[PDB]
Amino acid sequence: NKCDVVVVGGGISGMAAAKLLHDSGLNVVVLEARDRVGGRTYTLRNQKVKYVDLGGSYVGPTQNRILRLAKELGLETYKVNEVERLIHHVKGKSYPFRGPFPPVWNPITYLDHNNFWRTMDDMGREIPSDAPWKAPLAEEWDNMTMKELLDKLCWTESAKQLATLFVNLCVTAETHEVSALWFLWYVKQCGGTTRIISTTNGGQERKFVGGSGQVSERIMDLLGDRVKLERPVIYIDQTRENVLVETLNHEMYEAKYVISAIPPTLGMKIHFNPPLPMMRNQMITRVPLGSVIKCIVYYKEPFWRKKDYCGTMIIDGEEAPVAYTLDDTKPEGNYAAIMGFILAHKARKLARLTKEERLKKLCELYAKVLGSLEALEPVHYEEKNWCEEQYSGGCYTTYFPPGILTQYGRVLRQPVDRIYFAGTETATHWSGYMEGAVEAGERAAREILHAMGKIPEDEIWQSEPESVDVPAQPITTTFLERHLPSVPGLLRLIGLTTI
Amino acid sequence: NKCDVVVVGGGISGMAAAKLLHDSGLNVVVLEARDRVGGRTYTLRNQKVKYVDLGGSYVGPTQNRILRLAKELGLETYKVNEVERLIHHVKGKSYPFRGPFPPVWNPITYLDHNNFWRTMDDMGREIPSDAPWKAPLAEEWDNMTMKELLDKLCWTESAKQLATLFVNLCVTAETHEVSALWFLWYVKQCGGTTRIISTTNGGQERKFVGGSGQVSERIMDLLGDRVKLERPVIYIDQTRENVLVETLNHEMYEAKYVISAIPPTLGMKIHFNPPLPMMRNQMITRVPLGSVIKCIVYYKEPFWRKKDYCGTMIIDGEEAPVAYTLDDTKPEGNYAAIMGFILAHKARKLARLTKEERLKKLCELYAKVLGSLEALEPVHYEEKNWCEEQYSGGCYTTYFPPGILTQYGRVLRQPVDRIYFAGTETATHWSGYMEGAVEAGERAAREILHAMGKIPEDEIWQSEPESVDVPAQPITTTFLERHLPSVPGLLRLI
Numbered sequence: 007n008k009c010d011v012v013v014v015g016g017g018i019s020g021m022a023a024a025k026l027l028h029d030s031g032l033n034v035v036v037l038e039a040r041d042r043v044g045g046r047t048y049t050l051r052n053q054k055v056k057y058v059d060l061g062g063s064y065v066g067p068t069q070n071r072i073l074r075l076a077k078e079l080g081l082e083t084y085k086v087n088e089v090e091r092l093i094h095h096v097k098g099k100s101y102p103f104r105g106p107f108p109p110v111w112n113p114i115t116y117l118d119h120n121n122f123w124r125t126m127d128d129m130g131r132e133i134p135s136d137a138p139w140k141a142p143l144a145e146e147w148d149n150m151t152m153k154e155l156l157d158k159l160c161w162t163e164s165a166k167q168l169a170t171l172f173v174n175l176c177v178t179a180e181t182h183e184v185s186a187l188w189f190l191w192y193v194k195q196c197g198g199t200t201r202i203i204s205t206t207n208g209g210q211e212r213k214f215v216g217g218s219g220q221v222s223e224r225i226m227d228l229l230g231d232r233v234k235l236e237r238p239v240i241y242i243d244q245t246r247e248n249v250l251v252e253t254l255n256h257e258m259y260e261a262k263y264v265i266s267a268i269p270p271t272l273g274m275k276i277h278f279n280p281p282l283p284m285m286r287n288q289m290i291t292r293v294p295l296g297s298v299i300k301c302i303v304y305y306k307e308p309f310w311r312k313k314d315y316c317g318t319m320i321i322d323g324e325e326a327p328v329a330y331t332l333d334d335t336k337p338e339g340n341y342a343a344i345m346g347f348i349l350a351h352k353a354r355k356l357a358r359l360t361k362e363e364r365l366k367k368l369c370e371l372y373a374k375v376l377g378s379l380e381a382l383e384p385v386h387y388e389e390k391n392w393c394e395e396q397y398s399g400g401c402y403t404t405y406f407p408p409g410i411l412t413q414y415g416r417v418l419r420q421p422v423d424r425i426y427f428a429g430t431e432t433a434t435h436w437s438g439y440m441e442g443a444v445e446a447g448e449r450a451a452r453e454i455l456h457a458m459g460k461i462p463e464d465e466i467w468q469s470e471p472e473s474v475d476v477p478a479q480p481i482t483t484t485f486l487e488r489h490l491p492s493v494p495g496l497l498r499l500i501g502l503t504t505i
Numbered sequence: 506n507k508c509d510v511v512v513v514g515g516g517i518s519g520m521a522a523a524k525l526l527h528d529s530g531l532n533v534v535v536l537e538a539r540d541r542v543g544g545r546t547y548t549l550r551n552q553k554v555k556y557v558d559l560g561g562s563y564v565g566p567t568q569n570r571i572l573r574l575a576k577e578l579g580l581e582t583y584k585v586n587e588v589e590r591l592i593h594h595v596k597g598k599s600y601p602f603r604g605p606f607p608p609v610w611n612p613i614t615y616l617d618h619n620n621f622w623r624t625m626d627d628m629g630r631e632i633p634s635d636a637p638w639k640a641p642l643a644e645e646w647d648n649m650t651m652k653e654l655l656d657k658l659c660w661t662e663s664a665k666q667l668a669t670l671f672v673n674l675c676v677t678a679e680t681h682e683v684s685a686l687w688f689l690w691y692v693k694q695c696g697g698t699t700r701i702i703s704t705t706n707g708g709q710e711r712k713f714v715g716g717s718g719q720v721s722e723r724i725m726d727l728l729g730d731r732v733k734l735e736r737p738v739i740y741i742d743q744t745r746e747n748v749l750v751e752t753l754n755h756e757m758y759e760a761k762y763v764i765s766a767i768p769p770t771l772g773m774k775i776h777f778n779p780p781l782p783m784m785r786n787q788m789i790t791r792v793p794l795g796s797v798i799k800c801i802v803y804y805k806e807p808f809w810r811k812k813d814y815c816g817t818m819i820i821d822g823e824e825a826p827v828a829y830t831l832d833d834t835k836p837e838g839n840y841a842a843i844m845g846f847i848l849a850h851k852a853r854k855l856a857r858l859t860k861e862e863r864l865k866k867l868c869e870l871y872a873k874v875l876g877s878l879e880a881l882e883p884v885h886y887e888e889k890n891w892c893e894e895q896y897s898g899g900c901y902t903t904y905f906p907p908g909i910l911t912q913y914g915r916v917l918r919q920p921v922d923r924i925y926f927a928g929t930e931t932a933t934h935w936s937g938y939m940e941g942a943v944e945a946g947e948r949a950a951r952e953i954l955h956a957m958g959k960i961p962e963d964e965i966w967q968s969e970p971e972s973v974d975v976p977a978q979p980i981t982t983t984f985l986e987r988h989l990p991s992v993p994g995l996l997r998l999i
C-alpha cells in the first residue's frame with residue numbers, strides 16, 4: 007500500500023530512479039510487470055554461454071552515468087574486440103579494413119560519402135538536444151522521412167546504401183518509417199555520427215563483465231522487498247489526495263508521486279483517472295519501437311582472428327539476414343561468439359522461420375563474409391526477438407514517424423500532475439541507451455525531490471563527471487573532410503569555371 | 506460471468522455484432538468502457554440545439570449496411586442542404602460555385618487539377634479493397650507519404666493546396682503523416698474521390714433525424730441488461746477452455762469467443778495472456794487516429810441561404826481555423842447552424858484556446874467567407890475535441906504512417922485464437938465510417954458463427970442490397986476529363 011513514490015517499471019531507468027529516491031530517505035516501491043528486472047536489458051546464464059546479453063549490452067566513452075552507476079554496483083567493463091580488420095561486405099564481396107570507417111576510393115563516391123556524414127553532423131548542430139522541435143527548420147525536417155533526406159543528399163547509390171544501413175542499425179527501423187528531424191536529433195544527442203557508430207572511442211567500445219543485467223539485479227538487491235515482480239500497472243488514479251496505483255494481480259499502492267519509467271507507448275496499458283491531457287493521450291499512440299532480433303552464434307574458437315578479422319562485419323544487401331556483427335567472445339578469449347542484429351523489416355520477415363532455420367542462414371552468411379568454412383560449425387546459438395515482448399514493444403527504442411516530434415515532442419517528459427516521466431526515451435544525452443535510462447531515471451527522481459522542496463530547482467538536471475576508466479577522445483575532422491565539396495558543389499564549381 | 510460471446514466496445518461496430526449474434530440465439534455481453542454507447546458517434550440533446558451529432562453523422566449512397574440497420578431500428582434520414590451555391594475561399598476571397606468540385610480557370614492549372622484527381626482514382630484501381638498490401642506497387646507507394654506523392658504529381662501550387670485540404674479533410678491528418686498507399690486505399694474503398702467528397706450523391710448526402718447516436722442507443726434498448734457500461738476491459742486470458750475477460754471495475758466474464766470492436770491501437774489498453782503474436786503486438790503501437798474538433802455554430806436563421814449560399818465552405822490557407830463546413834440546420838429549417846471541422850495540426854494548435862475564443866475565430870472566419878455580419882451573432886455553440894478521448898484516441902479513424910500497411914496490414918482482422926476483430930478499421934468498404942463499423946461488426950459476428958459450425962464459410966462475407974431510400978447514381982467522367990494531358994504530358998507533347 008503506502009509509500010512516498012511508486013515507480014512503474016524496473017528497467018535501468020526505473021531502478022536508477024528508485025535507487026536515488028531510496029538513497030535520499032524516501033520510501034519507494036518499484037512495480038515491475040515481468041517476473042524479472044532489467045527490461046530491454048536481459049542477461050541469460052547457462053553453462054553453454056556462461057552469460058550473454060540478449061538486449062542492451064554496449065557502453066562507451068561519454069556514457070558517464072551508466073558507467074558511474076555500474077561501477078558503484080561493483081561492475082567491471084571490458085573492451086569489445088577490435089584488434090584485427092573490420093569487414094565491409096558489399097555486392098557479394100568482402101573488403102577488409104582498419105579504422106572506424108570503410109575506405110572509399112572513387113573520388114566522386116568519396117566526395118558524396120564525405121558530404122553525407124558531414125551534412126548529418128551539420129544538421130545536428132542546429133538541433134537542441136533538450137528540445138529538437140526548436141531547430142530553426144524543425145517542421146521542414148520533421149515533415150520528411152530519412153528516406154527523402156537520403157534521396158536529396160546522396161548523389162551516389164553507394165552512399166545511399168551505406169546511409170540506409172546506418173539508419174537501420176542505429177534505430178532498427180526503415181529510412182522511410184522515421185522522421186528526418188528525429189533521426190538527426192537522435193544521432194546528435196549521442197555525440198554525432200562517429201561517436202554513435204564507433205567501437206573504439208564510441209558507443210560500442212565496451213560491455214560489462216557478467217552482463218548488463220546485473221545493473222538492475224544489483225539495484226533490486228539493494229532495494230530488497232521494495233521491488234514487486236509480476237505487478238503490471240493497469241490503473242492510475244490522481245483524483246484524490248494520494249495517488250492510487252493498481253496492478254493486474256489486484257493490488258493497490260498509495261503514494262505522493264509516481265514515476266512512469268516505461269516506454270512512452272506502453273503508457274497505453276494503463277487506464278488513467280482523470281483522463282490524460284489531450285496531447286499525451288494522442289502522443290502515446292504515435293510512438294512505436296523498432297524491430298530487432300539479437301542473435302549470438304557460438305564457435306569452438308574465435309577463428310576469424312586467425313584470418314586477421316576482428317569479427318566486425320558491415321553487410322549490405324537485401325539477401326543478408328544480418329547487416330551488422332560484433333565479436334562477442336568473452337574477455338578471457340573463450341565462449342567464442344559472433345553477435346549479429348536482424349534489423350527492421352528483416353526481423354519481421356525472418357521471425358517466421360524456426361530458430362534452427364535462422365541459425366543456418368546466419369552461419370551461411372558468416373561463412374561467406376569471413377571466407378571461412380569454420381563458420382558453418384556452430385557449437386551453440388542464442389537469440390531474442392524483441393518484437394514479441396508485450397512489456398517492451400520492441401527494441402532498441404522508440405522512433406518518431408514524420409510529423410510527430412514537432413507536434414507532440416514537448417510532452418514526452420512533461421509531468422502530468424503528480425506523474426513524472428523517466429525511461430531512456432526522455433533523456434537528452436544517449437536517449438535510446440542504458441546511459442539515457444540513468445539520466446532520465448535520476449532526473450525524474452530529482453524532479454520529485456524538488457516538488458517536495460528537498461532540493462533547489464537548479465539541481466533537477468545534474469552534470470556527470472567523466473569516467474576515469476573510460477575516458478573520451480575528442481571527435482576530430484581533417485581539413486579536406488571539412489572543405490571538400492559535395493557532388494553538386496563540384497558540379498557548380500565546374501559550371502562556374504566553364505562559363 | 507458466463508455467455509457465448511463477449512463483445513469489447515459498444516460503438517456501432519460492437520453493437521451491430523452483438524445484435525447479429527443475439528438475433529441468432531447466442532448469449533452475448535457487450536463490455537463498454539464509457540458511461541454511454543456510441544463511441545465515435547455521440548448525439549447531444551439540450552433545448553438550445555434539440556439534438557446534435559458531435560461525432561460521426563453523415564451517411565449517403567453506397568452505404569447500404571448502415572442505412573439498413575438504422576431503418577430497421579426505426580430511424581429516418583434527411584438531406585444535407587446543398588440547394589444553393591458552394592463557396593471556395595482561396596487567398597482571402599470567396600468564389601461561389603455549383604457542383605461538387607470547385608472550378609479552376611487557368612488552363613495549366615485546369616490540366617494539373619484534372620490529372621491529380623484522375624491519377625488518384627487510376628492508382629486506386631490497382632489496390633484491392635480487402636488487401637491493399639497486394640497492390641502491384643504496394644511497397645513503393647507505402648514507403649512514400651502523401652506529401653511526397655503530391656509533390657511529384659502536382660505541377661501547380663493551386664492543385665497541391667487543394668489536394669492537401671482534401672487529405673486533411675478525409676483523414677484528419679497531415680499529408681506528411683500518412684502513407685500514400687494507405688490514403689489511396691482509403692479513398693478507393695469509399696468508391697473514389699467523387700463519392701468520398703460529394704454531398705449530393707456522396708458520403709455527406711444525409712444525416713439521421715434525431716442523431717446517429719440513436720443507432721447504438723436503440724441496439725442497447727434491444728439488448729437490455731446485456732450491455733455493461735463503465736466496464737473497460739483490462740485483461741483477456743485465452744490460456745484455458747473458456748476465454749476470461751476482466752474489467753477495470755473488477756468483474757469477470759467467461760465466453761467461448763471474443764469480439765474486439767475497439768480502434769486497433771486501443772488494443773494496447775488490454776493485457777493479454779498469452780501475449781499477442783509478434784505482428785499484432787507491434788501493429789497496435791503503429792496505428793494512430795487523426796485529430797479533429799467538430800464545431801457547430803448556431804444562428805437565429807440560415808442567413809447564408811438568402812445570399813444564395815448553401816453553407817458549404819471550402820476554405821484554404823493556414824490562417825483559417827476551419828477548412829470545411831456544411832449547413833447543419835434541422836430539416837424543418839430551424840436550429841440554423843454551420844458545422845465546421847478543425848483539422849489535424851490546427852486541432853492541436855487551437856485546442857489551447859478557450860471554447861469562447863474558438864467561437865470568436867469561427868464567427869469571424871464565417872463572416873469573411875460568407876460576406877455577412879450576421880455570422881458575428883451566434884445564438885449558441887457546441888464543439889467536441891476528439892483528441893482528448895481516452896477510449897477513442899482521436900477521430901475519424903486510424904491512419905497508417907509510411908511503411909506500416911504493407912508490413913502489418915494483413916494482421917488487422919486476423920483472428921487471435923478465439924478473439925475476432927471488428928471495428929470500422931477492419932472494413933473493406935467505407936472503412937473509417939459508420940458503414941464500415943456495421944460491415945466489420947456483422948462480419949466478425951459471422952466469423953464466430955462459422956467457427957461454431959452454425960454457417961458455411963461462404964457466408965462470413967455477405968453482400969448488401971442497395972437502399973431503395975438512398976439509391977446511388979453512378980460516377981461519370983467526360984471524354985476530356987479522361988484524355989486531357991497532365992502538365993508533363995503537355996510539355997512532352999510540345
Ligand SMILES: *[C]C1=C([C])[C]=C2C(=[C]1)N([C][C]([O])[C]([O])[C]([O])[C]OP([O])(=O)OP([O])(=O)O[C][C]1O[C](N3[C]=NC4=C3N=[C]N=C4[N])[C]([O])[C]1[O])C1=NC(=O)[N]C(=O)C1=N2[C][C]C1=[C][C]=[C][C]=[C]1
Binds near residue numbers: 020202276299430
Ligand atoms: C532490446 C535492445 C537490443 C536488442 C539491443 C540494444 C538495446 C536494446 N539498447 C537499449 C537499452 O537496452 C535500453 O535503452 C534500456 O535498457 C531501456 O531502459 P528503460 O528506460 O529503463 O526502459 P525498459 O528497459 O524497457 O524498462 C521498462 C520496464 O517497465 C516494465 N513495464 C512495462 N509496462 C509496465 C511495466 N511495469 C509495470 N506496469 C506496466 N504496465 C517493463 O517490463 C520493463 O522492465 C542498448 N542500449 C545500450 O546502452 N547499449 C546497447 O548495446 C544496446 N543495445 C544495442 C544498440 C546498438 C547496437 C549497435 C549499434 C547501434 C546501437
Ligand SMILES: *[C]C1=C([C])[C]=C2C(=[C]1)N([C][C]([O])[C]([O])[C]([O])[C]OP([O])(=O)OP([O])(=O)O[C][C]1O[C](N3[C]=NC4=C3N=[C]N=C4[N])[C]([O])[C]1[O])C1=NC(=O)[N]C(=O)C1=N2[C][C]C1=[C][C]=[C][C]=[C]1
Binds near residue numbers: 514516674799940
Ligand atoms: C469522431 C468523428 C467525427 C468528428 C466525424 C466523423 C466521424 C467520427 N466518422 C467516423 C465514425 O464515427 C466511426 O467510423 C464509427 O463511429 C466507428 O465505429 P466503431 O468501429 O464501432 O468504433 P468506436 O465508435 O470507437 O467504438 C468503440 C467502443 O469501444 C469502447 N472501448 C474502447 N476501449 C475499450 C472499450 N470498451 C471496453 N474496454 C476497452 N478497453 C469505446 O468507448 C467505444 O464505445 C464519421 N463516420 C460516418 O460514417 N459519417 C461521418 O460523418 C463521420 N464523421 C465525419 C467524416 C467526414 C466528414 C466530412 C468529410 C469527410 C469525412
